[PDB]
Ligand binder design. Structure first.
Ligand SMILES: [Mg+2]
Ligand SMILES: [Mg+2]
Ligand SMILES: [Mg+2]
Ligand SMILES: [Mg+2]
Ligand SMILES: [Mg+2]
Ligand SMILES: [Mg+2]
Ligand SMILES: [Mg+2]
Ligand SMILES: [Mg+2]
Ligand SMILES: [Mg+2]
Ligand SMILES: [Mg+2]
Length: 1105
RNA sequence: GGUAGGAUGGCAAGAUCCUGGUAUGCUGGGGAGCCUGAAAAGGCUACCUAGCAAGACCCCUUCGUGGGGUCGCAUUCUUCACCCCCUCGCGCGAGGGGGUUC
DNA sequence: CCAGGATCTTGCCATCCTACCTCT
């Protein structure tokens, strides 16, 4: 079975692709391309418009389900409490729309004397407050909510705006009181802002907070004189909220101790470890050399950094006052970036941060927790560390001292430095003890405390272990399929080459502005961090830093309309929204008021500003452009300029264009994680080395091996000047992987130097031995790639999605239409009947000797009969009676008393009937709702051959010829076609071109076509396999940059894409030599029929068993 | 030494999920106001209320077409088949995962 | 949208380790 040869593996990752090569070798030269293939994956994306992954959509749906389930349980507990109290909950129907609001208003205004009426109004109000309670921090308890200032400043500003807007003053002016007053005074007023799409205004502008509803509840209990235990139980039932939790398996494991969880940043062991490691990395000047700090100097600096309350010790202070050095610059190896006026020495040394937080909390709360203050001063650092570990790991889903419950609530309300560190608590304590006692650094402490050697590297994940990142998992699944198939074919690889997504070929001024930008970012982030710790934000997130930056930048106003905003009612609006692919980069983030954010919604900003009467486009662009530079802000001059241009360019767009910036993080993560798992495979399988090379070393290798993708695959120019990029053809990933199999480190250094020389703005051949042996080894690589591409041995393949999982139907429920039994029945109304047995009865009426509905969508099928009684299996309909019908004449299923359209088609079943010399073809397009209502979403079901009933939307909206042929007993299923199946038209190409395809084939003779969809009953959507789609996107964008940068072939490609080939099923499946190609992991077509999807010719496919 | 990789700590910029909430929206049931109406019933603006993938599994029950709980859109060659790994871990065939070469 | 937890990438600063090439 295995034919072992010496071969190398090249791995070239991409965001939507991965190129994998198995290249058999000689002593240093390539011998044969064993397999080269570009695998085109979706990056996990199931939301093509938004870019959100399938895992992200599943997680948001699951969390919405969990929210609804917890809300239902909480409301049931409230209903039990109201039944205990004798308070009547708000009824489901037959009450006024304003009964709850007037209940809240009256209970806030005057004492209700009537006993049953007061209980009814209290039940109405409390049930309505539980349904609409406002937002609170989920990490804060109900006691913290009671500790909040009531009402919030947002509601006080909203109430001031309402008293100004309506010239009245309600007392005490609660949310229910103002809402009832406005719903009675100005009927039809909306309360909260919503998305715009003749117009009106809204009553409230900010997000309702839970302290506002809590304060209204306290005001109602104060007016009505309710007992305190009663209102405390009511507050517990209304504002009950499940605390957020961290699953323990979501926390990584310690590499030195693989059973233990990674320690939190809050741990005092980590704070000591960071201090001792930072001190152990410092050096001291000694006669043009450097020495490590001696053990007494280590102890002095370490005790000065441990015994610290705040950031008071700079590295200059460590050099001068602690080390007693004559000069500041004698302290070398300071772990900061250097700058003017000794910036690195002016940066601050680390300290015990958790001990500072706990000591400051004690100093502010001596009377609140004096027992804890005495106990904290009493305990040693081991029990202190165990306390701190318990306080840090309370957030884990899955306190050693009998403390009072108020002290427990104050301690769990304490804010500690979050984040995980690399090691566990035991490992950190052991390493710290070894570094303190032996006077060694971290590497020697690891060698001592664990017995590891100098070659020790942390354990790496195996190939079967996923990461949880969708793009990385796509690349890894493709890689492990390729590696298993290649290992069983040719044995294990001799070495493995992975391309990392790292680059360094930049000019010195680019490095200078990046260093100055980093300096400015750190300085402004430190100042804003100090302001937020002064303001109570103990641990500012990057979102908090962005929010404080834009509050400072726009003088606490909204960016869009200019309304004054606070910290708590402002919102960080994605200017390009998340549902249009917008990123969390700070140029995409605008500070808003919440009302502007809700009214903009998911729309582009320029279109929203055109439609809206609240903001103006020119005013927002002008307000951005008049921002002026100052002394010390976050951006540099050039960064402030580019920030203004990128913000303005985001504010100016009118369509839902794709996002400008794409995720290079998942490219680097895919390369790094695939390298780690390939290293695990190499440890298991005896691979000699796993080598890594930069992104710009492979391209420089390809351009110095006289290989260009245009010349290799006979591509044409698509630009008027110069030559286009190599990304037109999808096979360039496999060519990149083939080139990667050749590279060695010395050649990598020389091509990196050549690239740095070239981008340092002809052409000098690089001067080195390693380049010369690489060229003499790889002179035949060009001939080998030409011979491989001429036979089309390089494959572009898309992995199939065959599992019947995903959205069963479209999200929006739709109201049922209706049609009288004894009236005229057309074809579209007969195809829309909701009830399957009523449907089958109408088919029995039109055609008793038939099982399907073979009627035209426009023809009048049944006449208007006043004596037509549809006899059901259990009922008789009347001619006056009406039938539920689906609203529109497309595939639909009934969902929860409404109608939902079916989702995208899971597959098409290919049917072939007629003569063998001239067959007829059709597709039974089957969706996930078809299998859902056919009961096929269970165990032991082949979804591509399991029979569907005639009332499913597959058989309802099949073609008339297909329906008549299955009725006649001539059409049997011969295969299936998922979106992503490759069609091979043979070496002769395709003949049925006309109009746009004929012009496409004069520049692009494409024989390989990928199914993307099934638009209607006689059309299959095909795109060329070999040509990219993002390439077509950037060509169509770059057409309008200059007056006709493109050539004629570029215009042909841009006017073929993105609709590509809207084919015709009975035309394209009758091509001679057409084969539906199902490939193996090595890009080779699977032809032997086993238990995996095989290749099949539609013209000569035998019928299904 | 220089280049490249890896560790740890720091700084900066981002990505990916996960947990809990808010508000909207959709559909069913309602209705406060307004309009067109009325021997002749529907819309509009809000608001209230239930549900918000189809469904699966467990427990009820002082027996019901329902109450309660846990889940259900990922891992993209479904199912079947053969091999492998971790867990039902006695060379057990039941849960998850992985591979099947043209 | 909100708070906040977890995983990870890239780039710089410091330290340690590894392999590898290039000169003298
Ligand atoms: Mg590449
Ligand atoms: Mg809720
Ligand atoms: Mg609520
Ligand atoms: Mg509203
Ligand atoms: Mg927004
Ligand atoms: Mg690539
Ligand atoms: Mg409403
Ligand atoms: Mg609602
Ligand atoms: Mg449900
Ligand atoms: Mg498989």
């Amino acid at each position: 079975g295995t034919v072992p040869v010496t071969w190398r593996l090249g791995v070239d990752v991409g965001e939507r692709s991965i190129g994998l090569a198995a290249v058999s070798y000689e002593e240093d030269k390539p011998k044969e391309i064993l397999a080269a293939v570009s695998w085109i994956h979706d990056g996990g994306v199931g939301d093509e418009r938004s870019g959100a992954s399938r895992l992200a959509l599943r997680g948001m749906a699951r969390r919405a389900r969990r929210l609804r389930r917890f809300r239902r349980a909480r409301l049931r507990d409230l209903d039990m409490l109201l039944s205990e109290l004798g308070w009547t909950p708000l009824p489901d129907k037959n009450v006024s729309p304003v009964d709850a609001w007037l209940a809240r208003k009256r209970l806030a205004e005057e004492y209700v004397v009537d006993e049953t009426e007061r209980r009814r109004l209290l039940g109405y109000a409390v049930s309505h407050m539980a349904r609409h309670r406002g937002w609170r921090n989920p990490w804060t308890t109900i006691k913290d909510l009671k500790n909040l200032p009531q009402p919030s400043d947002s509601w006080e500003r909203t109430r001031e705006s309402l008293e100004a807007r309506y010239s009245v003053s309600l007392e005490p002016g609660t949310v229910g009181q103002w809402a009832g007053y406005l719903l009675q005074r100005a009927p039809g007023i909306r309360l909260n802002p919503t998305q715009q799409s003749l117009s009106n205004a809204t009553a409230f502008e900010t997000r309702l907070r839970q302290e506002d509803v809590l304060w209204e509840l306290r005001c109602i209990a104060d007016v009505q004189g309710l007992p305190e235990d009663v209102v405390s139980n009511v507050i517990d039932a209304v504002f009950c909220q499940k605390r957020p939790s961290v699953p323990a398996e979501r926390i990584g494991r310690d590499p030195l101790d693989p059973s233990q969880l990674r320690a939190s940043r809050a741990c005092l062991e980590f704070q000591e470890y960071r201090i001792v490691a930072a001190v152990a990395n410092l050096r001291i000047r000694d006669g043009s050399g450097s020495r490590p700090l001696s053990l007494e100097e280590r102890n002095a600096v370490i005790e000065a950094l441990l015994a610290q309350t705040e950031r008071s010790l700079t590295w200059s202070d460590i050099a001068l006052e602690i080390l007693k050095l004559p000069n500041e610059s004698d302290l070398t190896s300071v772990p900061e970036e250097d700058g003017p006026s000794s910036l690195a020495y002016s940066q601050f040394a680390p300290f015990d941060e958790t001990s500072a937080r706990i000591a400051e909390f004690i100093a502010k709360n001596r009377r609140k927790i004096p027992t804890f203050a005495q106990w904290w001063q009493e305990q040693d650092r081991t029990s202190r560390s165990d306390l701190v570990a318990a306080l840090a790991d309370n957030s884990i889903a899955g306190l050693l001292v009998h403390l009072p419950d108020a002290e427990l609530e104050a301690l769990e309300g304490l804010a500690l430095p979050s984040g995980r560190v690399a090691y566990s608590r035991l490992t950190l304590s052991g390493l710290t003890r070894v570094m303190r006692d032996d006077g060694v650094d971290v590497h020697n402490a690891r060698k001592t405390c664990f017995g590891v050697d100098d070659n020790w590297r942390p354990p790496l994940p195996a190939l079967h272990e996923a990461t949880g990142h969708p793009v990385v998992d796509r690349n890894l699944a493709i890689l492990r399929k390729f590696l298993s198939s290649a290992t069983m074919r040719w044995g294990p690889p001799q070495s493995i080459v992975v391309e990392l997504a790292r680059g360094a070929s930049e000019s010195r001024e680019r490095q200078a502005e990046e260093e100055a930008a980093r300096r400015a970012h750190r300085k402004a982030n430190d100042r804003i961090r100090a302001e937020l710790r002064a303001s109570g934000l103990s641990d500012p997130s990057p979102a908090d830093l962005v929010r404080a930056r834009l509050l400072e930048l726009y003088d606490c106003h909204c960016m869009y309309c200019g309304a004054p905003i606070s910290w708590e009612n402002s919102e960080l609006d994605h200017i390009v929204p998340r549902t249009d692919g917008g990123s969390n980069r700070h140029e995409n983030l605008a500070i808003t008021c919440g009302a502007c954010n809700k009214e903009k919604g998911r729309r582009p900003f320029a279109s929203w500003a055109e439609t809206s009467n609240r903001v103006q486009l020119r005013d927002v662009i002008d307000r951005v452009q008049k921002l002026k530079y100052s002394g010390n802000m976050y951006w540099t001059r050039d960064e402030f300029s580019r920030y203004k241009k990128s913000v303005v360019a985001r504010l100016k767009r009118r369509t839902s264009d794709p996002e400008v910036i794409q995720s290079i993080e998942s490219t680097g993560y895919a390369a790094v994680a695939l390298r780690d798992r390939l290293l695990s495979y190499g440890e298991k399988n005896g691979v000699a080395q796993v080598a890594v090379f930069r992104g710009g070393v492979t391209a420089e290798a390809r351009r110095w091996l006289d290989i260009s993708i245009e010349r290799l695959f006979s591509r044409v120019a698509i630009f008027a000047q110069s030559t286009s990029t190599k990304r037109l053809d999808r096979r360039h990933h496999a060519v990149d992987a083939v080139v990667l199999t050749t590279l060695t480190p010395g050649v990598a250094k020389t091509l990196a130097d050549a690239r740095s020389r070239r981008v340092s703005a002809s052409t000098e051949e690089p001067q080195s031995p390693a380049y010369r042996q690489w060229k003499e080894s790889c002179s035949g690589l060009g001939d080998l790639l030409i011979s491989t591409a001429a036979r089309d041995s390089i494959a572009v393949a898309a992995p199939l999605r065959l599992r019947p999982t995903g959205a069963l139907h479209e999200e929006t429920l739709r109201a049922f239409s209706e049609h009288t039994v004894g009236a005229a029945w057309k074809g579209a109304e007969l195809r829309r009947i909701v009830e399957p047995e009523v449907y089958a009865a109408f088919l029995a009426l039109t055609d008793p000797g038939g099982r399907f509905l073979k009627v035209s969508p426009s023809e009048d099928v049944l006449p208007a009969d006043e004596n037509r009684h549809i006899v059901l299996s259990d009922r008789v309909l009347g001619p006056r009676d009406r039938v539920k019908l689906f609203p529109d004449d497309r595939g639909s299923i009934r969902v929860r008393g409404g109608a939902a359209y079916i989702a995208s088609f899971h597959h098409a079943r290919v049917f072939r009937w007629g003569s063998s010399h001239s067959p007829s073809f059709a597709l039974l397009r089957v969706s996930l709702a078809d299998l859902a209502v056919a009961g096929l979403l269970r165990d032991g079901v082949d979804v591509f051959t399991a029979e569907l009933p005639p009332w499913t939307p597959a058989w309802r909206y099949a073609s008339i010829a297909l329906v008549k042929a299955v009725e006649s007993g001539d059409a049997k299923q011969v295969g299936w076609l998922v979106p992503g199946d490759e069609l091979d038209f043979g070496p002769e190409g395709v003949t049925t071109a006309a109009g746009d395809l004929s012009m496409f084939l004069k520049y692009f003779p494409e024989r390989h076509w990928v199914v993307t969809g099934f638009e209607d009953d006689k059309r299959i959507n095909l795109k060329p396999a070999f040509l990219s789609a993002e390439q077509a996107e950037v060509l169509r964008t770059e057409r309008s940059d200059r007056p006709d940068t493109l050539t004629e072939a570029g215009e042909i490609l841009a006017q073929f894409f993105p609709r590509c080939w809207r084919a015709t099923v009975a035309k394209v499946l009758c091509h001679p030599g057409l084969t539906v190609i199902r490939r193996t992991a090595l890009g080779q077509p699977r032809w032997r029929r086993g238990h995996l999807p095989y290749s099949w010719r539609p013209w000569s496919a035998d019928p299904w068993s």
